[PDB]
């Protein structure tokens, strides 16, 4: 019984960074939508996407960081994440989608919870986008990617568990019946 090299080797992922204008810029755009918003397939940016934000990014007027902040602030992110899921889970959703990691500690939850309760969701997403961790871990002008943090306490197991938690529940109208043929 010898463990092979695949013993938590492949959790990492390809990193997307902005560059000179090319058709690959839309691949970077796709990555921003794919991670900040949870489009599961990664091949389907549905209708809701913000083309004006894409236009600014293509021109170079908007940096990837600002693109993320606008996308998180927009009603698109709110409808898919904020309004349906409870604010308590919304904090974790912000950490997973924006920073790329699960919330490290209850203290982090506490800070963002009062921001959500009084200041608002847009304030919360702005604070995380402006947070120092995003500037280095996620980088500046770099499309944020899923990151498993080893140093924070229990964050590897927490990040693995939260990332294992695929999005459940949905924005619901005409909720489904239990039985189908």
């Amino acid at each position: 019984v010898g463990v092979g090299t695949t013993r938590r080797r492949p959790a990492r992922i390809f990193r997307m960074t902005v560059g000179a204008p090319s058709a690959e810029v839309e691949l970077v755009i796709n990555a921003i939508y794919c991670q900040v918003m949870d489009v599961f397939s990664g091949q389907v940016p549905s209708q809701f996407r913000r083309p004006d934000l894409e236009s600014r990014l293509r021109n170079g007027e908007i940096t990837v960081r600002e693109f993320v902040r606008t996308l998180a602030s927009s009603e698109i992110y709110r409808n898919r994440f904020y309004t349906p899921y409870p604010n308590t889970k919304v904090i974790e959703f912000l950490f997973r989608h924006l920073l790329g990691r699960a919330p490290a500690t209850q203290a982090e939850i506490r800070q963002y919870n009062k921001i959500l309760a009084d200041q608002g969701l847009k304030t919360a997403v702005e604070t995380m986008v402006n947070s120092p961790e995003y500037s280095r871990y996620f980088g500046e002008d770099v499309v944020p990617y899923k990151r498993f943090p080893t140093l924070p306490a229990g964050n590897y197991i927490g990040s693995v568990k939260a990332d294992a938690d695929l999005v459940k529940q949905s924005w619901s109208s005409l909720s489904p019946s239990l039985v189908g043929i």
Binding site: S46, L174, P176, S177, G180, I181
Partner: peptide, 17 residues
């Protein structure tokens, strides 16, 4: 089938997609 028919978890444009 009933899954496609109303209330079958596939009986919406979004659900079907």
């Amino acid at each position: 089938s009933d899954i496609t028919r109303p209330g079958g978890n596939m009986y919406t444009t979004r659900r079907y997609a």
